[PDB]
Amino acid sequence: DLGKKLLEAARAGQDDEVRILMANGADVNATDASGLTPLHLAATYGHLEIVEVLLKHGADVNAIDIMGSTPLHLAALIGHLEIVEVLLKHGADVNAVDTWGDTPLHLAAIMGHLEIVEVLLKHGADVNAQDKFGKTAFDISIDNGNEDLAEILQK
Amino acid sequence: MRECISIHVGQAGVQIGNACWELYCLEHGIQPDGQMPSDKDSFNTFFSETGAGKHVPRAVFVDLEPTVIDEVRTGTYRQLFHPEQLITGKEDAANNYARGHYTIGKEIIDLVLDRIRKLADQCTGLQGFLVFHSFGGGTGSGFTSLLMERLSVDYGKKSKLEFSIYPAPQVSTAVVEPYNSILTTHTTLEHSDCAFMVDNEAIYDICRRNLDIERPTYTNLNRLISQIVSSITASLRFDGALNVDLTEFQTNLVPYPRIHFPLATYAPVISAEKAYHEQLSVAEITNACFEPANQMVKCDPRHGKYMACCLLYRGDVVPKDVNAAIATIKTKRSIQFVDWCPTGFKVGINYQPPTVVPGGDLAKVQRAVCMLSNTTAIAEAWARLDHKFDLMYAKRAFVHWYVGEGMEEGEFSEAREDMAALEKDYEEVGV
Amino acid sequence: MREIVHIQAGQCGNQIGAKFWEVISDEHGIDPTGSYHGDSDLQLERINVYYNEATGNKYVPRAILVDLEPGTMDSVRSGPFGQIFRPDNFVFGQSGAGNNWAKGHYTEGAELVDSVLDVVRKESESCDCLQGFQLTHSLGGGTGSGMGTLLISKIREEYPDRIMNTFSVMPSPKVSDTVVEPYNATLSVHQLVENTDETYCIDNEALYDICFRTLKLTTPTYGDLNHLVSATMSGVTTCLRFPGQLNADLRKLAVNMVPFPRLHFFMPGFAPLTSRGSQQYRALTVPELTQQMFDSKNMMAACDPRHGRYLTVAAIFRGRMSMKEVDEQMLNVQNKNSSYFVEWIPNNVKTAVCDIPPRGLKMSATFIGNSTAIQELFKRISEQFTAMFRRKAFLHWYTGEGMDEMEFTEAESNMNDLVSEYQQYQDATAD
């Protein structure tokens, strides 16, 4: 089964194995037990070159795992600015909501990724999107006392 | 003789002890090396005599850390005290009653008692003990209540008198002082025959108002206290007719064992900068004893009823002038005695004026008076403490420090209920 | 109690720990070769608390330097005071912790921990009366957090009757955007609530915001952040290092500061705020110092005190100033801001004055507060921990070191329980 091998090369950042596996029929949109695809895992571990390759060979930029996490949610959470941009350029849904009601904007705001926050706003991120507890990225800013984030959100 | 042994526990007890013994020496004409030039004695109640002509205080100083006692060991009175009667541990009770009573205190209690026994064994007719301590500190509160328990077993028939420092926020060192104050009062109540509380707030105010000291320090407070304590013990150290032994203090001032907290009032307290003050008559200083501002404890005797009242004069006081002054007090003032006590005043006159320590804040005066009275107004002092206890104890604030040091939480409630019964004891007398 | 054993673990721990020694050594008059060069008797009176006295008249820090990364050994030896530390007291590993708390707590750090206890044991057995331990470390890395919490736990089992105190620096994405830090901090806080008596929360969020918004430093460095830390650490330890009677030792500080066992995370503050070699703060008075002390901008934890209530406060004034004026202003701030102090802990603010100010200042004020507003710090970390933990990101880095996933839910649950306790006491009334 080349799917499991493609998931591990994608997580491990092995560019060479990724290309070889795809050349032998490996399912680019394979999933692990939680529903994470090679793209979800390359986006999580910061493997930009693998993210780009998967996107040129059929990867679903908006795939969701069992928890509604998209690759953009994970790139936004972990803080990979470059991957966030590549995903937005390939049609990633900036306003995708996961099982906790979080959008990527929420996750970038909580983790303090201010540059990613600016990027997501510039691409249409909904500032009124509320999580499961009714909080927007702006409320997170007020509640945490993050003046830097508040200022960025006020534009 | 009829000897008295003074025990000084903790920083407060020790520092006040140092100030008293300094005064006693000046009053009896004893030098800091213990020698006394050829004079004749009643001072023997408080000082032993060595074969070399040295007069040694019948005193023990105990603390769980050595800092304060080391000052005593190196100070002006370094040769006065028996060196084996200055006892110290290495580590203190951290403002925690439980530590002074249960854990740290138990490491030195047998040593302290064997040292008290060495003093006791040099006495012909030991009357009892004078114990000086703070309510608020860990040693002052916890070790003293351990010591008083042990003394009751070893010296059952002997009298025990206390001089206790009641907390004031202006000079308090701990938030838990209300707790320590209540835990020591509960455990020492049955072991103490008579207790003179000194309210640091009262003394602080007398220093500010009467002595013009902007920010009084312990040095100031202690010199004023030592002057009041000397007036209370003078009867034991000199010939006289009122309060001539420890038993007489209970007879005269404690009608019922539990309500054994006399209020002391002292006048005149004049600043050393007013050397040429016009001397105050007997009438004026006797009147001054009924003014709340001159009391050692903050409370209002006009809101209470008197059970006993002693007036201890020192100086140029003609007995007829005292009688005339008391006469005016009975007629003019609204001083209410309980119905079951003879509505009278016991009077003692010692005809030497008070002594003032060089370095002190007080002026020399020709006559002074210390009034000791057992009034129900003193229950205001307990109520103030009980209220602070109740605020912290309702949320169990700081209790873990105590239970973690060998104490059962249940002991907070037993002590507090004993304090509720004490407040009622005063209510039932004075209504 | 006299001696404190100081431990510094990890990069942050050593960096801030090295600065601590450089700053207090200047205040105590110790040159970088350990010789005394001071012109005041107060500088040596309590020197034994942090320095061991060596062969010559040479003082040596009672410090243990620890890290799994050897590179930090070199950084510390290169400093001015790098040669003052005992060489036998540098305990270092081969491979670092990789910012993984599990490597510090369970694998690499557990191999080295025994080696460290041998140096602690040597230092502790040389002490006349060991007071306790002091640790400096970060909660966001691996060595300081994972190994430091391991060390704390192994020290508490050997020396259970001693005080364990930490200077724990909290992570912030503003200073280090390594996203596993909330995991490391949360796992550390769980250890800290159970095994320390006193922890000073030094929040990098607040250190960054002070440098950036107040000191107008466009690009704060760790040197700028550490300048604030060293000034705070000098302030909070003043009472332990100079003669005094309030909070003079770790245990008395703890009984006054900690009303409930788990609520022992203090929010320190300092005034005036200053940058490295600016000397801007000059015209600063007692009322200004007193108001600045209680301002949010002066707090070393990113918490607004006006969003909670103070359970206890210890304030330390340093310099030549009127004790009367300090009494007055401190009372004024409590009356003016009555709503920010819990009513059920009477006289919960304690004030100390030390005559010696810090280096480069004539007047200074340090604030040590136990405020329910500290829950804003924990809620911030909790939220970041939950964001990450929900998606299970990088959990394999921890479970791969034999760490059970339920140790994460237990830490999270404990931290959430801690936040709920602060709110319980913030809403509690006297009634």
Ligand SMILES: Nc1nc2c(ncn2[C@@H]2O[C@H](COP(=O)(O)OP(=O)(O)OP(=O)(O)O)[C@@H](O)[C@H]2O)c(=O)[nH]1
């Ligand atoms: N009047 C007066 N009060 C004092 C003196 N020293 C301390 N106090 C008060 O006593 C209380 C503290 O008790 P301390 O005697 O200092 O403590 P301790 O008995 O040595 O007990 P630990 O230090 O806890 O072991 C506070 O209310 C202080 O204000 C003193 O010299 N005179």
Ligand SMILES: Nc1nc2c(ncn2[C@@H]2O[C@H](COP(=O)(O)OP(=O)(O)O)[C@@H](O)[C@H]2O)c(=O)[nH]1
């Ligand atoms: N204030 C301050 N924070 C530091 C310093 N060095 C590292 N940190 C913080 O410590 C955390 C990383 O911990 P670190 O000590 O480097 O890892 P360790 O060496 O494994 O304990 C991050 O939150 C850093 O921002 C320093 O000198 N000062």
Ligand SMILES: [Mg+2]
């Ligand atoms: Mg003491």
